[PDB]
Design a protein around this ligand. Structure first.
Ligand SMILES: [Fe+2]
Ligand SMILES: [Fe+2]
Lengths: 389, 136, 511, 168, 389, 73, 136
């Protein structure tokens, strides 16, 4: 070949001998813990913290940064590469957030790869089982195909809300939490479309095209409030803390949990749907993993920052009242769907829908509202959405 | 042939002879090339693909291909395009092998590269401008 | 019912991605841009979230197997030539910031695109750059555990802040990725940064690593670039998506030439310096590596082929070629002269290094080699010499200036590379500029380029106090991380530095 | 000059003393606008605290933001600048000014001054970022038109620098 | 240390130099395909076939073997290590079986490890979701805890039936199919007990001990026929082909499929059980993977062996009539469970149970009976089990 | 209900393994032996099927990484 | 101490001196030993456990421990028992680490070895005969 075949210093006898003579017989320092100076959240430093913390090169005028001086190149007009103007919230140290699941990139894709491959094995077996035969065909073709299909656009919109978050946020552990949350949302949307494409291979004449779902998401009054909220969270604001709080802690925790768990997953287990719970098992696992990290960032840290907690709760309570109102409206439009399903006692009658709403709002009060000092009357919100039943 | 060698042309010169041509006036603007460069990371799967796909059927259908050994990776340059069918590689290796598995050890592309079906293509064509991308 | 076994393959889902977006009045990017990305753009790699994870996890398992099982059992971590194990402190941590900032840049492009498939291409890149951040960190983490000098491998996220080379890295691979028109950032990041410069920085470097005993870096870096080639496709897709925009004819070649000069200004001298001076065994002259990867292949296969669509060969190319021949030797003078501000140990070129430099860069011995050999006789390596070459430069009129735009140092009295000093006063502040392309950038856009340089921050302070304050010491609190030799004895301490009595001047005070 | 240490020095300590004595939203707004006109951008009045002004500015922002949440009604936090003006009105005003600009030198000065006067916490974050983005789009279009047209000797005169040295 | 530190031939300069001088400059043969002489089932040799085939050192007097001579050591009395006396079936080549999933050891544990880790992530999220709250507590405490719990003993008994199969069978690909099938059965049993232990952490006073399930399996008439069949398949025979055929192709394909899919999985999706379908998703995936391999061994190969197919179908038809009778009896006892659940139209009424039986027996006729020439009247078997409704 | 995150660890399942066997007259080995293995014997490694696979797959990934990636290169 | 070295006792002799003791009459029956032997496969995780657990806290509580380097593996011999807590190893490594993960690189045991909780124990005791095995 035209170029030299390079000899390896590890195995070539001549180069290995030269390298051995140059390596000292002793270590030149004894501190072998990578970025030993990171303050650990837990008993000892974790690999997650070692590989993540202080990758972002913030100067000392962004709270917590170790560097100094102005950025080397800014936007036309002077917008800094990163800056305090990106959010209303304040803190003594932006690096303080920890994902309780301690996900750096490798455990995250390791876990999702398990779900990727197992899903395909499950579908091949489900097709061989002929288990589709017991699914109520009205639930299948009317509610599942059309209205579950339309929910993918709520997940997709929440996914896209993170684009500006991924650019604007101010530390490395926060950036990882946000991007992993974003991929899980777009994963949810693709998984819903995967279920529909799967049913299309088993049931002839089942139309898995997105045309009807997109039409319903954009023009069916059942999704009118949901779409309005998602369009506002995504494209109406750029405060990156507002987007994460509004998207995950208010909208997805109320409307999103009701739609995924209380309607589609729960009622699948009254109309004999053995396929849909396999997919909602994933979206609900993704919701709980994301919540752990959202909780740490906002509830554990920012709402209790030694200097700015009360300051921060002021904005969080304001955001919450505005977006909870949008989400209550969204649920009021959505519960109209119950008019299209078979009345089952304790499930799709007024008492069952009221108990489901009491679960979503009662959980939300314990998980989020009580912890930031937000005062909410669960009963009053349940009554407000039942108005649309 | 040898116009695609790593050390082709000016690269063979040393000392002042290299400098003179490196600074020649005609070499101060880029020169359009119809080549593509493909870099494959060395591994059990890749070394089999190199010897039994690229250097047999591949070079039979594109004699311009040059493969050079760069210790940790294979450096490949050819006129026009290089194509690798992951389905053929799976038959060779005796194990499941999608186009996404092939990409585990495809390390660089100087050219327009894309995936369609089981096939990985790197081409000098301006995909999306001169020729549209398609679905399955 | 039909009971044949079926699944759903990734490309079956991907075909429906484009229809996931929907129209409303507010559906527009939040970031300032001169361009409008066409809504029908398609992506070259059909990737969905589940298949993304399956593909990346398989790469990881093989990489971590090699590292944690095989190479550890072989003791590979301490079979690296000391010059190269030191150089990897800089390469992997400096590259880390490029990986990190590329997360934010790709998210800004995901925001800027309107086609769901183009958003998806950028989104996959967002996730890849997180992967690469942790991969670069893992290299220094592994070296910290297994190599004979963990200092600097173990704390560069804070010890890099001491020295001047880090400022220039922040311009090309941090601020340049995220601060500006989304499209100007895209060309800095993807079409130049990734399609052009990550080939020498990430691929070609692995041959230098292997030559010097390092099989850790090839294991990781070659996996890093498997993702990067999908990023090269992202940048090309950027061009496709604005190709029918009349703004492209007005603006693209200007943003492209600015981005090309920006990237080459730092990487052309810095990579050549790290490759040739940070190695014992050399693969080939840096200027040949640059010729192959940058000028002939990138220039011909990417830029040359885009001439059909109005892309011109960059106006600054002729200046870039002069840098490729001489500027890394210029930088070496500054890097060796200012060694105490780094976080790696250096070695002067030895007799056989010098013969190699002169043979491949005729004239090197009479300009650079003569200086290095004088410094050696003056006691460059010896802590009881009281000698630090930065004062030697000052005492002989070879002042060092920092380019206000690029942050790259410049020694006009000695440089053979491209450039010339311009000193302007504006509104009570003096500024040093070093080339025609950067001066225009600063003159037209002064509020983009206000970066404090090391002389402005350290003016009048003594060297050892700056190093102590920055934690540029080993775990005994006294011995410097940086050293002017790679031997295991006679390491310099804070007091050896203080004995030289080096105080930072204001280089522009004389003007 | 002899610089003090980077992160902890007498300049930063003295300014933190001044900042602690702000007690009202109106007083803090004037303080921060004056500070930003005096010490930020290439058109600042003084480079005296060049290496410290960015940290000091952070501390003024922190004081103003807490005063806002302690003393203003919630709806004001969302829709009004701390100058008392309507946030949406500020946005419309400054976009109109830059779209009426005739040179890059007039446009550049409008954008820089908008940031000096209304950078958060003066203006609400969402309104500010949106306005800053619109201004930057205009500034870039003008500046990047015929970017290489004027030779360096011409641009030096247009900018107004005192050339202290040109290497020959 | 007391002993020499051995120098590595790969990296020590002196030893590497000596080794390099001794290695020839050319290959001494060009055939690099490992066990190139194996006849491929598919287009080209698979790694599965390369690593598996002819590992068993059979001589030429066991059909297909490549070796020669008597074994080196036999049982007291003369029983051969392996021999033709182990089964009634005959073939021209015992090495002809291929698992269509091509599982050697690594893909098998790779896949189950994905299911292992994802299960724990799903349980942690399910507990956080509070999704237990919607499960009918009678289904939970009476049917789930007691009668699903007792089914673990059917799976455990089928697992143990493979012990003599694992010792006695006559080729390597068959041995791998059998052992993997066995581990999946014991996995099923442990997974059922895992579900019960999980519910015990969420519902106070839920007793997850096996005492009641074991009592019901051993003495409740609902499981009397099932237990009798399983005890016979496990301990009543030693023909290793009879055990695999009876266990997987008759008993588990009829009683097992009805119990797992038609009763516990299907009715979980009428009584609001969102947890049980996660576990039956695994058992049913394992059943379909096992069936592919059982089908190849018996239906594709042995029933069509060029010399012994009709001979083999004689034994297979005899086995089938005997064990199908036992399984029909087992289902007749089992359908008594329907007397203990809420009557739901099309599910637990006589029409729904009859449609479920028509699925199990109709599938079985297509998958197995038609392919070995076994004549069965589906309607007559449905009537026979309905007798116990 | 209590909504703390919980799973079930391998050794929690293993503790119930001994009770999976049950008594019937035919429950005896099929193979000739002079000995009788006591019914109460316990095992030193508490392994269940799912954890068996997780443990062995992790060994495999590292081994095949070393072989197919590093040592081949 | 050094009675647990790999080359202890007879192993130091060579030639005829070794033969004489190898064939001595008292060495034709086994001699009961209270030792255990543990073999650890070399890897990143194991090398950290060796230096920071076995050779610090371990040898502090059992001074009989001898560790020898056998190229691909660590050879360990001690009086009585050796114990390794996987939970302590996880804290040291900064990543999740169960007793089953520890076993990824535990390669051999001459002794009675068992798992209980997070702990791996190899002991000279006759578990199941002299001391019963337990559950969690
Ligand atoms: Fe990257
Ligand atoms: Fe990249």
């Amino acid at each position: 070949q035209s170029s030299q075949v390079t000899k390896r210093g590890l195995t070539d006898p001549e180069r290995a001998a030269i390298i051995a003579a140059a390596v000292p017989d002793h270590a030149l320092d004894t501190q072998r813990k990578y970025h030993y100076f990171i303050q650990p959240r837990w008993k000892r430093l974790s690999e997650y913290e070692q590989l993540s913390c202080y990758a972002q090169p913030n100067p000392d005028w962004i709270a917590g940064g170790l560097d100094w001086g102005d950025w080397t190149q800014k936007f036309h007009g002077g917008r800094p590469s990163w800056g305090n103007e990106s959010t209303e919230l304040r803190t003594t140290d932006w690096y303080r957030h920890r994902d309780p699941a301690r996900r750096w990139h490798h455990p995250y894709v390791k876990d999702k790869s398990e779900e990727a491959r197992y899903t395909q094995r499950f579908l091949a077996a489900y097709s061989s089982e002929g288990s589709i035969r017991t699914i109520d065909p009205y639930w299948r073709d009317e509610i599942l195909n059309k209205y579950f299909g339309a929910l993918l656009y709520s997940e997709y919109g929440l996914f896209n809300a993170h684009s500006s978050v991924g650019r604007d946020c101010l530390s490395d552990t926060i950036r990882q939490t946000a991007v992993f949350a974003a991929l899980d949302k777009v994963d949810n949307a693709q998984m819903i479309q995967m279920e529909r494409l799967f049913i299309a291979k088993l049931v002839p004449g089942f139309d898995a095209s997105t045309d009807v779902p997109k039409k319903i998401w954009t023009t069916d009054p059942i999704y009118s409030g949901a779409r309005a909220t998602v369009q506002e969270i995504w494209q109406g604001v750029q405060d990156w803390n507002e987007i994460l709080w509004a998207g995950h802690a208010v909208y997805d925790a109320t409307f999103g949990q009701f739609a995924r768990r209380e309607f589609f997953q729960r009622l699948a287990t009254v109309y004999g749907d053995t396929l849909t719970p396999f997919f909602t098992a994933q979206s609900q696992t993704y919701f709980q993993t994301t919540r752990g990290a959202i909780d740490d960032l906002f509830v554990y840290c920012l709402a209790n920052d030694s200097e700015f907690g009360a300051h921060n709760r002021t904005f969080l309570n304001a955001w919450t009242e505005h977006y909870l109102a949008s989400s209550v409206a969204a649920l009021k439009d959505f519960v109209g769907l119950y008019a299209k399903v078979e009345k089952v006692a304790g499930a799709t009658d007024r008492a069952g829908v009221s108990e489901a709403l009491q679960r979503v709002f009662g959980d939300w009060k314990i998980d989020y509202a009580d912890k930031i000092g937000f005062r909410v009357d669960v009963d009053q919100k349940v009554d407000a959405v039942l108005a649309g039943y | 042939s040898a116009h695609n060698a790593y050390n082709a042309g000016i690269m063979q010169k040393t000392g002042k002879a290299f400098a003179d041509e490196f600074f020649a006036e005609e070499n101060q603007v880029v020169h359009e090339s119809n080549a593509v460069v493909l870099v494959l990371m060395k591994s059990d799967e890749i070394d089999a693909i190199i010897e039994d796909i690229v250097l047999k059927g591949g070079k039979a259908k594109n004699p311009s291909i040059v493969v050079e050994d760069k210790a940790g990776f294979w450096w490949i340059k050819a006129d026009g395009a290089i194509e690798i069918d992951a389905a053929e590689a799976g038959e060779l290796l005796g194990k499941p092998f999608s186009v996404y598995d092939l990409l585990i050890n495809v390390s660089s592309t100087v050219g327009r590269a894309y995936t369609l079906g089981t096939k990985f293509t790197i081409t000098s064509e301006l995909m999306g401008l001169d020729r549209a991308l398609t679905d399955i | 019912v039909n009971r044949a076994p079926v699944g759903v393959e990734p490309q079956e889902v991907h075909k429906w991605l484009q229809s996931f977006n929907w129209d409303f009045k507010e559906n527009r990017t939040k970031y300032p841009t001169k361009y409008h990305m066409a809504n029908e753009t398609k992506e070259q790699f059909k990737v969905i979230a589940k298949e993304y994870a399956r593909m990346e996890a398989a790469k990881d398992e093989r990489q971590f197997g090699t590292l944690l099982d095989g190479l550890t059992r072989l003791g590979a971590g301490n079979k690296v030539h000391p010059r190269w194990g030191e150089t990897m402190k800089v390469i992997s941590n400096f590259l880390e910031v490029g990986e990190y900032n590329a997360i934010a840049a790709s998210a800004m492009l995901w925001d800027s695109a309107t086609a769901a498939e183009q958003k998806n291409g950028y989104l996959a890149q967002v996730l890849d750059e997180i992967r690469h951040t942790h991969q670069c960190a893992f290299i220094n983490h592994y070296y910290s555990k297994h190599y004979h000098d963990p200092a600097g491998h173990n704390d560069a996220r804070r010890t890099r802040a001491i020295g001047p080379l880090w400022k220039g890295m922040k311009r090309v691979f941090a601020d340049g990725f995220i601060s500006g028109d989304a499209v100007e950032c895209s060309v800095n990041l993807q079409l130049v940064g990734e399609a052009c410069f990550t080939n020498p920085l990430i691929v070609a470097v692995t041959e230098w690593a292997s030559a010097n005993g390092d099989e850790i870096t090839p294991t990781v870096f070659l996996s890093v670039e498997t993702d990067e080639l999908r990023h090269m496709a992202n940048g090309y897709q950027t061009v496709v998506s604005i190709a029918n925009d009349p703004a492209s004819a007005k603006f693209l070649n200007t943003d492209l030439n600015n981005a090309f000069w920006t990237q080459q200004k730092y990487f052309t001298p810095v990579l050549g310096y790290l490759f040739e001076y940070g190695s014992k065994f050399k693969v080939e002259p840096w200027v040949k590596t640059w010729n192959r990867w940058v000028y002939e292949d990138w220039g011909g296969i990417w830029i040359g082929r885009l001439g059909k669509y109005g892309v011109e060969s960059p106006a600054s190319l002729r200046d870039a070629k002069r840098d490729a021949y001489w500027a890394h030797h210029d930088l070496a003078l500054a890097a060796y002269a200012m060694w105490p501000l780094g976080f790696a140990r250096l070695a002067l070129p030895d007799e056989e290094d010098q013969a190699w430099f002169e043979a491949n860069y005729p004239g090197w011995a009479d300009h650079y080699g003569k200086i290095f050999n004088e410094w050696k006789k003056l006691g460059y390596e010896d802590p009881k010499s009281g000698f630090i070459p930065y004062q030697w430069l000052l005492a002989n009129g070879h002042d060092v200036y920092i380019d206000r735009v690029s942050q790259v140092p410049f020694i006009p009295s000695l440089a053979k590379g491209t450039g010339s000093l311009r000193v302007h006063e504006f509104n009570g502040k003096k500024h040093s500029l070093t080339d025609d392309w950067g001066e225009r950038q600063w003159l037209i856009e002064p509020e983009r380029y206000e970066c404090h340089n090391v002389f402005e921050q350290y003016e009048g302070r003594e060297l050892s106090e700056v190093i102590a304050e920055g934690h540029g010491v080993r775990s005994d609190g006294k011995t410097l991380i940086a050293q002017p030799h790679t031997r295991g004895d006679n390491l310099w301490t804070l007091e050896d530095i203080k004995r030289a009595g080096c105080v930072f001047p204001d280089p522009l005070a004389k003007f | 000059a002899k610089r003090e240490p980077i992160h902890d020095n007498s300049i930063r300590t003295e300014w933190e003393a001044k900042i602690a004595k702000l007690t009202s939203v109106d007083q803090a707004t004037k303080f921060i606008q004056d500070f930003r006109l005096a010490y930020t951008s290439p058109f600042r009045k003084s480079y005296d605290i060049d290496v410290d002004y960015q940290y000091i500015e952070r501390k003024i922002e922190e004081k103003l933001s807490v005063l806002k949440t302690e003393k203003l009604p919630v709806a004001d936090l969302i829709t009004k600048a701390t100058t008392g003006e309507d946030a949406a009105a500020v946005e419309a005003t400054w976009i109109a000014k830059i779209k009426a600009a005739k040179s890059k030198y007039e446009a550049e000065r409008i954008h820089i001054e908008f940031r000096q006067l209304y950078k958060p916490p003066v203006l609400p974050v969402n309104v500010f970022l949106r306005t800053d983005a619109a201004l930057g789009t205009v500034l870039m279009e003008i500046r990047n038109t015929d970017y290489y047209g004027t030779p360096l000797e011409g641009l030096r005169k247009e900018r107004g620098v005192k050339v202290l040295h040109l290497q020959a």
